[PDB]
Design a protein around this nucleic acid. Structure first.
Ligand SMILES: NC(=O)c1cccc2nc(-c3ccc(C(=O)NCCc4nc5ccccc5[nH]4)cc3)[nH]c12
Ligand SMILES: [Zn+2]
Ligand SMILES: [Zn+2]
Lengths: 227, 475
DNA sequence: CGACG
DNA sequence: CGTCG
């Protein structure tokens, strides 16, 4: 269950959010934390945003940033290790977990190294076409566009859901289906090993793929250690 | 239609009407998966006199102050209706003149809300009875009442409540089986979008709880029979003489005759009520006000096939007095084939009781309504296929005409009398010895509307043993 | 929900 | 359309 998770963290989707303390605008593409609060204008939660420093200036006792913050595992590993610290500020199994976490770090840095060149060389419409060409579902927002592109290129082109056939997307804990079983409900099917095919790059994105130096290092989505 | 007060123009402007349609949309949105209980009222308001128009929007959650509104004076009715229709589209996904509405995800859903010197020469007790059963005042108290919790958005129309009742039939059949949690989640979504409920900021619940499901179904059946008896309440437009007493008396097609209170049959009925009134589980005494021997048109002849069928008995049937009018106009009915069968203790069919207490408990007479109604019926219970524990059924066993749910408490079998060759069980509550059973008092059930023959109608007074009766009972 | 770039 | 309130 998402459980709302009022504490929230992500990169600034726009440069319009005003910090509720200093009232200054939060620049675009900047690490920012918010708290989800029930607005009195409409029946729907809304994020009160703060600068990274201003958020911790107002006092918070976040004991487990990973589980209590939605999107924590979706950031850069460096900004993560920064939040993990700023929040509070065995004999063999120990090394096992340490090495698997090193693998997690490698995977995170890899995905970000991807997205960098991804948007550096490609336009938004190019990413849209990449997603289209793999039976995917074009999301809303450049950030989500690049997220799904990286997902499909790393872990394989996602295939339709088994029940509603709607495309699923990676969540903090597991892959959740964004399809609508019926016009009244949303599909809640959640699994960690969905059925996928291999990503496909057209001849258009062949020289562009070489510009990306597509390594095609196959792997599997590492999921949180929690439970 | 009405005019939302958040605009404040109810005294300065009225809602518009063109081409028969009216411009007041009441869109809902319920998502239990996340807990969204949103609403949206959209109106196009025209000044009472001048040609001045506004578009009023209001949104938020149900019952709570969370939300907002906005009034936008429009240039002319043309632009006003354009904006109104495009808003309806943007919100609910469908068009204003969409005969067939097709729900879309993340979109709202519209809700239908209903709006809008002579002298009789009859015996007087019957006229009092009529004033009671055709009590337009209580009918309006039932339908046209605020009770925000029941109707957080408005008095829904009949078709809305009937669709909700059908979806509840589906919910019941899903509860009986091991249906998927997602199917019941969708059932809940649709049933709460169709019928709004003030749950505050609490996440709307799922219909997993069967007892609350049967309770909401009781509420829906109440409102449904209410609107039905209201449709029967109307319909007259001729014979403007002899007071409406005769009008609504003949609207039943029944021959009602006030049985003389001092008569023998009346004395036997009084003894029946006295003995079978188990104050246990009944915090109210009963007083026999009036007796009415009723001969329903047609029911007399359709009962002849079973007139010779042995084991005929006089039994109690009791429901809300509001329905009694229709119950006399059409005779005792059985649940429709499309209604759910799991809710019924022993499936669909005419229910009866040998203990007046149990049947009276269904009149739902409140403290403010000490008067209740109940019916005595000559039902020809052919052969009682007895059932201790509850059991929904479909097939009448071979050579069996009726079901008998057995409770430990029964009328004294020795104390019975053959009135017109019909067994009357006017005994006091004895311990039948029946063990390993579910019922408290016995339930008698038939499965043929012609098997019954309503003989008497009792006006009863539910003297609730309260402080008043308490003072009267110690001096 | 609406409001605005 | 895609953010923010
Ligand atoms: N008045 C007597 O003479 C009388 C005497 C003794 C026992 C009696 N039982 C009834 C009775 C109960 C219930 C019903 C009845 O509408 N079921 C509703 C069950 C049900 N769940 C639902 C859940 C969802 C949707 C629809 C649903 N219907 C009818 C008669 N009347 C009795
Ligand atoms: Zn700040
Ligand atoms: Zn799905």
């Amino acid at each position: 269950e998402s459980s709302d998770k009022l504490y929230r963290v992500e990169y600034a989707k726009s440069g319009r959010a005003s910090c509720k303390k200093c009232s200054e605008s939060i620049p675009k593409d900047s690490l920012r934390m918010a708290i989800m609060v029930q607005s009195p204008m409409f029946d729907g939660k809304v994020p009160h945003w703060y600068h990274f420093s201003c958020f911790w200036k107002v006092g918070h006792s976040i004991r487990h940033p990973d589980v209590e913050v939605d999107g924590f595992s979706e950031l850069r590993w460096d900004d993560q290790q920064k939040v993990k610290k700023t929040a509070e500020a065995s004999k063999k199994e120990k090394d096992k977990d340490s090495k698997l976490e090193k693998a997690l770090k490698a995977q995170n840095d890899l995905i970000w190294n991807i997205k960098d060149e991804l948007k550096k060389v490609c336009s938004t419409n190019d990413l849209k076409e990449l997603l289209i060409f793999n039976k995917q579902q074009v999301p809303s927002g450049e950030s989500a566009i690049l997220d799904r592109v990286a997902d499909g290129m790393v872990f394989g082109a996602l295939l339709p859901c088994e029940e509603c056939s709607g495309q699923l997307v990676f969540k903090s804990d597991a892959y959740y289906c964004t399809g609508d079983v019926t016009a009244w409900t949303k599909c809640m099917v959640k699994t960690q090993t969905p059925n996928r095919k291999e990503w496909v790059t057209p001849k258009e994105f062949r020289e562009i793929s070489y510009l990306k130096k597509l390594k095609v290092k196959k792997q599997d989505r590492i999921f949180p250690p929690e439970t | 239609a009405a005019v939302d007060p958040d605009s404040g123009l109810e005294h300065s402007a009225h809602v518009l009407e063109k081409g028969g349609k009216v411009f007041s949309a009441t869109l809902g949105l319920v998502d239990i998966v996340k807990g969204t209980n949103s609403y949206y009222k959209l109106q196009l308001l025209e000044d009472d006199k001048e040609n001045r128009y506004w578009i009023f929007r209001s949104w938020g959650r149900v019952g709570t102050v969370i939300g907002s509104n906005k009034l936008e004076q429009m240039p002319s009715k043309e632009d006003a209706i354009e904006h109104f229709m495009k808003l309806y589209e943007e919100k609910t996904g469908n068009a204003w003149h969409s005969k067939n509405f097709t729900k879309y995800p993340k979109k709202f859903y519209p809700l239908e809300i209903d709006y809008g010197g002579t002298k009789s020469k009859l015996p007087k007790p019957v006229q009092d009875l009529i004033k009671m059963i055709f009590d337009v005042e209580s009918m309006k108290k039932a339908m046209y009442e605020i009770d925000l919790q029941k109707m957080p958005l408005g008095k829904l129309s009949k078709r809305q409540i009937q669709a909700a009742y059908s979806i509840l039939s589906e919910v019941q059949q899903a509860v009986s089986q091991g249906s998927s949690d997602s199917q019941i989640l969708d059932l809940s979504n649709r049933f709460y979008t169709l019928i709004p409920h003030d749950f505050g900021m609490k996440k709307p619940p799922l219909l997993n709880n069967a007892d609350s499901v049967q309770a909401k179904a009781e509420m829906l059946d109440n409102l449904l029979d209410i609107e039905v008896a209201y449709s029967l309440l109307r319909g007259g437009s001729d014979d403007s003489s002899k007071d409406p007493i005769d009008v609504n008396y003949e609207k039943l097609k029944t021959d009602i005759k006030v049985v003389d209170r001092d008569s023998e049959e009346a004395e036997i009925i009084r003894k029946y009520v006295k003995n079978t009134h188990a104050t246990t589980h009944n915090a109210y005494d009963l007083e026999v006000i009036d007796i009415f021997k009723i001969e329903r048109e047609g029911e007399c002849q359709r009962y002849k096939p079973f007139k010779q069928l042995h084991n005929r008995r006089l039994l109690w049937h009791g429901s809300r007095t509001t329905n009694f009018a229709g119950i006399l106009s059409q005779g005792l009915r059985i649940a429709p084939p499309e209604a759910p069968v799991t809710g019924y203790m022993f499936g669909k069919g005419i229910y009866f009781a040998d203990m007046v207490s149990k049947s009276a408990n269904y009149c739902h007479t409140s403290q403010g309504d000490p008067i209740g109604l109940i019916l005595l019926g000559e039902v020809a219970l052919g052969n009682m296929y007895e059932l201790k524990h509850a059991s929904h059924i479909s097939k009448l066993p071979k050579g069996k005409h009726s079901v008998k749910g057995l409770g430990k408490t029964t009328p004294d079998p020795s104390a019975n009398i053959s009135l017109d060759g019909v067994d009357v069980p006017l005994g006091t509550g004895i311990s039948s010895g029946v063990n390993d059973t579910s019922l408290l008092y016995n339930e008698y059930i038939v499965y043929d509307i012609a098997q019954v023959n309503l003989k008497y109608l009792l006006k009863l007074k539910f003297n609730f043993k309260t402080s008043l009766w308490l003072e009267h009972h110690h001096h």
